[PDB]
Amino acid sequence: LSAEDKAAVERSKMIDRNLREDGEKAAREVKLLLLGAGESGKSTIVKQMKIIHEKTTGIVETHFTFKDLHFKMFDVGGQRSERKKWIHCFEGVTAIIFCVALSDYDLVLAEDEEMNRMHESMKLFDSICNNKWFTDTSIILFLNKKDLFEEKIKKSPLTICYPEYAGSNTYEEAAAYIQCQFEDLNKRKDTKEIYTHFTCATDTKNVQFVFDAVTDVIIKNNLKDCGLF
């Protein structure tokens, strides 16, 4: 009820309505977190998504649009500090795009103490999936390099990894075995969903899969908000 105090409340309402308009525009974006092993095919996935819209390390954002839906995909590979001190920042991401290279069941890590790379990827998957911050976050699993898989699945038997295996050294019944082995690590199988896909070097069939999964994720979020539940 003053003269100089009037241009201190209208300014606050200007700022408040600008913030309100900016807050509902960022709720229409789909935020994804990319994770992967030392070399699983994350770069080739980023290349496949075909980014359209838009010392110095850390987050590497990537914006694109598919069928009127804006995706922003955060890749954290330049952050080599402790994971527990910043992993809770991405507590409200829509989904996770964990990538695993199929043709890694024969090699070992460059650190050279003789463990399977596939086993290490499984350990990372079960250390990320069963987390306190990610208890309802859906996971999109990509199993890249299925063309190279049908080069080593003939000469090299699977028994090097998962020694208990029921034979059938072919493409089928071996990729399905790996998919089941990865999906068995879920401790909340009745609440949390995992969408698996074999990608190889397929074209315009990966962004479609991501779109199909995030559609279900958005529907589930709206269901939880409605009251259904």
Place this chain on the structure above:
Amino acid sequence: DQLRQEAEQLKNQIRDARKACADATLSQITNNIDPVGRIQMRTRRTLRGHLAKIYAMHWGTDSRLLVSASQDGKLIIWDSYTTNKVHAIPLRSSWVMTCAYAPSGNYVACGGLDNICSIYNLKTREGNVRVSRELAGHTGYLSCCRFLDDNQIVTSSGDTTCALWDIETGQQTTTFTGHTGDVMSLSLAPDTRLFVSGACDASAKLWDVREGMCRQTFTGHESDINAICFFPNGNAFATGSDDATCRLFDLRADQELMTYSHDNIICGITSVSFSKSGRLLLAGYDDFNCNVWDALKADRAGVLAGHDNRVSCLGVTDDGMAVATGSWDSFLKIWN
């Protein structure tokens, strides 16, 4: 070679000249003085307008002005005597975990997972906030930043090093190394000639701004140190860690003085601050609460419940009138 055997012998020498100096204990003294009683505080104001978790907060140099950073890309400057939003600044990266207010009234600092410290000019010639500088050179996330002056600023990051910058030229004037883990928290002495850093290897170090060499190292915690603050006298400091306990260290005695811990508390400490006189020690917790401790006797003199997700930032005004607490629900509360 074997010069490592020279180590663990000088450490034994320091421990030897750290026990004969302990004549008494701060708990034995301060027995005669009466307790402060029961501190009851009321939430006078509630500031809302953020749309995500609030990660940092700083107070204006005099009073009445506060800056807050949240994980939605907005830096909000409020006037606390009212609930007016003086400023709102959009950030280039929405992953920020620190903020600072210059002790002059016109500058702001921000930093986060992008490894860049952004310095914003508040009062310009046109009235619109513009990015005055973008200091780069860290190889880890920025964890803390404090304004030494209107031209210098001290930053602590997950690179496991600290840096004294030069805003005009944007170059690292000095680099402080020696920590074996990510430097999580940083505090500045009242005279701005020393500063302490608490890192993830359960240790704290007392540096020297002018020289650039560590002088004393304080251990005694078990897990990572998340917050640190300086005693108003300038001859002691307090730290908070993941052990759900706070501790008070002394510069001159080169020793621990007291441990502020209690049962029914297992969560962990995110923030720590001192009262104007130095008798109360406020500490935020992961259990959604904030506790006030009688610093001279280590008795819980009060609880500041009223949040529902966490307490990530906590500050006390220069005059000591009010206490501001931010939470992981886009809410700041001012208690008196």
Place this chain on the structure above:
Amino acid sequence: IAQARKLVEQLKMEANIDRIKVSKAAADLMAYCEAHAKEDPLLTPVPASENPFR
């Protein structure tokens, strides 16, 4: 192994410090906490009139 030499030099620089007794430090803390008790509007509450946030 120059890192070990740097650590040894840092330890020497720390060990060359001088220390005062804990009793004097506690006395100084008590003196500061007593000489400024009345000026703390938290340890000593102030009336709402004084409180800007009344």
Place this chain on the structure above:
Amino acid sequence: ASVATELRCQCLQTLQGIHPKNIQSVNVKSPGPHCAQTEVIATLKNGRKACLNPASPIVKKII
């Protein structure tokens, strides 16, 4: 509230055969919201009560 309260006509069936001297007592009600048409209640003998014909040409003729 009170939405189960109903007022209905008392006489279930109209019976003819008006017998002189076989009537202990008579009683006449009035039209209203309860029942539209007028109904007559008469005790022929003892406590049993019957209703005469509402037809005006015979009963109301004498009334």
Place this chain on the structure above:
Amino acid sequence: DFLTIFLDDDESWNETLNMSGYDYSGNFSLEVSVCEMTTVVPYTWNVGILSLIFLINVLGNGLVTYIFCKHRSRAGAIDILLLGICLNSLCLSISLLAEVLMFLFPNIISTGLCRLEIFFYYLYVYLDIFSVVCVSLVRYLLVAYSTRSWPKKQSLGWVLTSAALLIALVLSGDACRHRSRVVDPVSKQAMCYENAGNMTADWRLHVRTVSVTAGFLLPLALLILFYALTWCVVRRTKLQARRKVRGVIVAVVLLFFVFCFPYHVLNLLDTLLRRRWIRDSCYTRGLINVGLAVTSLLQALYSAVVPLIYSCLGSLFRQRMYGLFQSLRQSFM
């Protein structure tokens, strides 16, 4: 109003019957005609049950509105609608008043009080029936157009609750415009009843027809349509919580049907009796008489607990109430 004179079989029969012989039929026996002393529900039981029904209603509405008041910042249209349903205790209080006072004070019977007692009762009954269809519509809109932002606006909730209140007010005002004070003709005690004059029998089918067609059948059809569309959209997904949202839709629809059907069936079952389609008997009227009271009390009971059981079915509200119980047990004990 009503009068009679005992014939006394005197010299003058009070109607001149001695001089008239006419004719008499044969021997007739039994054939009971007059109906009186019919078992009806005592009037005290209605108020007694309605008092505790009001207590339950106000307790549940307070519990819901407190939790809404806490988490006011993150509230959608459905929360706004559920809070709008909570303006029922204020409508039932004004109906329990002017009836309890009217029960203790028999002289305060008035025509202007009966209408006030029945209008608020009709509004209380009808508000939630129309506020639930809006909830179903919002639930469909939030699953069909899931990528848009307008279905999550709170202005939609305010507009829909205003429309529901408007419809309920119109229906109650239409249905209450003929209540009045009527003197009972077997006990000469004043009461509230419909009094349309000569035609106070067609203004008992009009109210009942409006109540059944526009209060039961249309909301049921709209609910079934807007939930069938939602199921046909959410059936094609791969979500794990697909059998958990069927048991909520089915439960809601079946509960509405079960708790609102008997009152409407035991109104046709009485209209048939009034129109001489069922053989009338003393025992027949007396089973309907208590059935009407029981079914109306059932409808009031269902309408009293709609927000509580609509919020308890969700998981977010259950989490909030569990946290509230934890905070209530940690302190205060």
